[PDB]
């Protein structure tokens, strides 16, 4: 159905330690498939997925040339970012980047993003129309007016509408056994006591795909949030995601509580009990 | 595919 693709960059300056560190990874919906490390001896666009190894040497010779084009452009960019903000040369800062295309169930273009970020806060962005910029501060309108004289938006848009989408359907076809099949969550419930009458229930759901899920601890047909410990969804290591939701109960009422797991792989929302 | 990168 609906899928997406992202590309993440991370430039971090290290004064007194030589050239800064550039880290770039490539993401499909929830699966990383390429990576680049500026401090790696290979200096190539190494893969991080099985289905992507099919691409010939011309693919890796091209991706590598235009990700090293980025490390030298973003390092060049880091010095310019300092004198734009009049910061100290002996200081460390972080420059990030994110943009990719979102496709529908037919490979049809749906939305497009483009955002840079200097030290955790947004710097510049591309609007939804993919032809206009939105600078965050005055030091970014300096850059914004640079990418207005040069029609940068009409090239990035030509990428997201074009190269991004036309290339993404190639990835979905090359790995249809992995990226297109959604695993269901395996569910079960635990029980932990604390006091002589207070106990702690916990609803579990391990090993699913994708990450978007909702765990709901109800109580007699009415939802509950008081005394409901909830941790954010975490990865597993194989390509799946785990998530639990806890609740403290008194001894005697455990038969009243209920847990619900709403996900895609289950064509019915399960309703657990004790 | 990696995209084309520009400077500030």
């Amino acid at each position, epitope marked *: 159905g609906s899928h997406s693709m992202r590309y993440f960059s991370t430039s971090v300056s290290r004064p007194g330690r030589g050239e800064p560190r550039f880290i770039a990874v490539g993401y499909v919906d929830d699966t990383q498939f390429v990576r680049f490390d500026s401090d790696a001896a290979s200096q190539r666009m190494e893969p991080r997925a099985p289905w992507i190894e099919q691409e010939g*040497p*011309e693919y890796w*010779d*091209e991706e*590598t*040339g*235009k990700v*090293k*084009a980025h490390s*030298q*452009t973003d390092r*060049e960019n880091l010095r310019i970012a300092l004198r734009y903000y009049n910061q100290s040369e002996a200081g460390s800062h972080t420059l990030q980047m994110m943009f990719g295309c979102d496709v529908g169930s037919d490979g049809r273009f749906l939305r497009g993003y483009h955002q840079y970020a200097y030290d955790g806060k947004d710097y510049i962005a591309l609007k939804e129309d993919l032809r206009s910029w939105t600078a965050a501060d005055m030091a970014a309108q300096i850059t914004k007016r*640079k990418w207005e004289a*040069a*029609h*940068v938006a*009409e*090239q990035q848009r*030509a*990428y997201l*509408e*074009g*190269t*991004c989408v*036309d*290339g993404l359907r190639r990835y979905l076809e090359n790995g249809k056994e992995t990226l297109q099949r959604t695993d269901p969550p395996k569910t079960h419930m635990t029980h932990h006591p604390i006091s002589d009458h207070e106990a702690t229930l916990r609803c579990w759901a391990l090993g699913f795909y994708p990450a978007e899920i909702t765990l709901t601890w109800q109580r007699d047909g009415e939802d509950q949030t008081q005394d409901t410990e909830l941790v954010e969804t975490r990865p597993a290591g194989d390509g799946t995601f785990q998530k639990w939701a806890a609740v403290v109960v008194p001894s005697g009422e455990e038969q009243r509580y209920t847990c619900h797991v709403q996900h895609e792989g289950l064509p019915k929302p399960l309703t657990l009990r004790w | *595919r990696y*995209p*084309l990168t*520009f*400077g500030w």
Partner: T-cell receptor, first 113, second 115 residues
């Protein structure tokens, strides 16, 4: 993917309508160029198009129209000169594949007086 | 304008080395190297952005040696020259901030190898 120059060799008289074709591979939105190489010296840029005005004018009186429906970027000159006798290459930048120039097969043009 | 090269023509016997020295235009931070065989299209060899190498046509060998150490000028070097390497080597520069990404070529360097 590749670019194609169908006109391999043309010989016309001085003052004739000229058109050299250069079609790209149906799917990309590349940068477009047209170069000329006299037999002795190097290349020389003539035109370019990515801004969004389909018809582009340039040096030596040459024009060009961009037709995404046909995926063509054709050279034109309503009246060819005798000095226009040289090889004519068209260059595209295959955008997602990088920034290296991808040249055509090479059109060699002679003019007759 | 414009891009410069030195020298323009030369010729050597196979077995020795050659070296060409290119000079692009002011404030241009990208430089490509191309080779054009006789009567054919220019083939892509290598391309720079700011003193560091980004790509090399894998259909080449390690005998070719290019470098742009000072950030402006580039120098090509070829070891173990052969007749199969005789062609015209053309320097080309760009700006990387022009969205059409215009590459401007120089007069080039024609070579010839014999026995």
């Amino acid at each position: 993917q590749s670019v194609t120059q169908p006109d391999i060799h043309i010989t016309v008289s001085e003052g004739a309508s000229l058109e050299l074709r250069c079609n790209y591979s149906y799917g990309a939105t590349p940068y477009l160029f047209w170069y000329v190489q006299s037999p002795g010296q190097g290349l020389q840029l003539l035109l370019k198009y990515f801004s969004g005005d389909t018809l582009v004018q340039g040096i030596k009186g040459f024009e060009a129209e961009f037709k995404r429906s046909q995926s063509s970027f054709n050279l034109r000159k309503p009246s060819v000169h005798w000095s226009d006798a040289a090889e004519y290459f068209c260059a595209v930048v295959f955008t997602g594949g990088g920034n290296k120039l991808t040249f055509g097969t090479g059109t060699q043009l002679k003019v007759e007086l | 304008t414009g891009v410069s090269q030195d020298p323009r023509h030369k010729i050597t016997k196979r077995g020795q080395n050659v070296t060409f020295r290119c000079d692009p235009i002011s404030e241009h931070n990208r430089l490509y190297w191309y080779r054009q065989t006789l009567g054919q299209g220019p083939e892509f060899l290598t391309y720079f952005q700011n003193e560091a190498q980004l790509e090399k046509s894998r259909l080449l060998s390690d005998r070719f040696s290019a470098e742009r150490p000072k950030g402006s000028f580039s120098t090509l070097e070829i070891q173990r020259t052969e007749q199969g390497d005789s062609a015209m080597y053309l320097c080309a520069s760009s700006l990387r901030d022009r969205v059409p990404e215009t590459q401007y070529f120089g007069p080039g360097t024609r070579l010839l190898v014999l026995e």
